[PDB]
Amino acid sequence: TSDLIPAPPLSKVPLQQNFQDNQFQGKWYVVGLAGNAILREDKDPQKMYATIYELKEDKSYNVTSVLFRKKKCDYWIRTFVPGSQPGEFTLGNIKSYPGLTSYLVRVVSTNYNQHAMVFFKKVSQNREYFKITLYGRTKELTSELKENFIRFSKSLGLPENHIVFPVPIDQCIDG
């Protein structure tokens, strides 16, 4: 009833050295999206969405994703609590998500003011999902950065049809 490309070993997922949590704050556009549950679709292409990171006093992120769906703005809210090392996080209040037993975030690379690559691994209803997101501070990034994202996604076992580049939009994500 479900087939998934296996999640890579964490050894294949680099960590951004000297992660600066204050500089990673603010709005990021999802210009690239890859994962074992991500599928390319050409009848209904994925629309670009935005994810806003806000550091609280206790140094956990409030993470709000803003999606344009059904002619309305949908808000997906979660909390990233600092993990085993800087640039790694786990999900706050995992009990609120039914079936979710694990959720790991790892910032693979970033220059903070233009681009980032972030790796996610979650175990939900015993199934191990993973995704990589190419974050852009703007809605567009260079071909070099996008090709690097594709290369990295492929290095984690993902084929091309599991790698998408959401189409830029103006609704919801510009506020």
Ligand SMILES: O=C(NCCN(CCNC(=O)c1cccc(=O)n1O)CCNC(=O)c1cccc(=O)n1O)c1cccc(O)c1O
């Ligand atoms: O199980 C969850 N969601 C399932 C619903 N969708 C599948 C997510 N697909 C992934 O490939 C997947 C794999 C690994 C980690 C991960 O987070 N995600 O999403 C679709 C709806 N998505 C959103 O509503 C959505 C919109 C914007 C950002 C976002 O993360 N999500 O999930 C889930 C639970 C807790 C926290 C999350 O961030 C989740 O995505």
Ligand SMILES: [Fe+3]
């Ligand atoms: Fe998610």
Ligand code: NA
């Ligand atoms: Na299913």
Ligand code: NA
């Ligand atoms: Na949460």
Ligand code: NA
């Ligand atoms: Na966890």
Ligand code: NA
């Ligand atoms: Na391929």
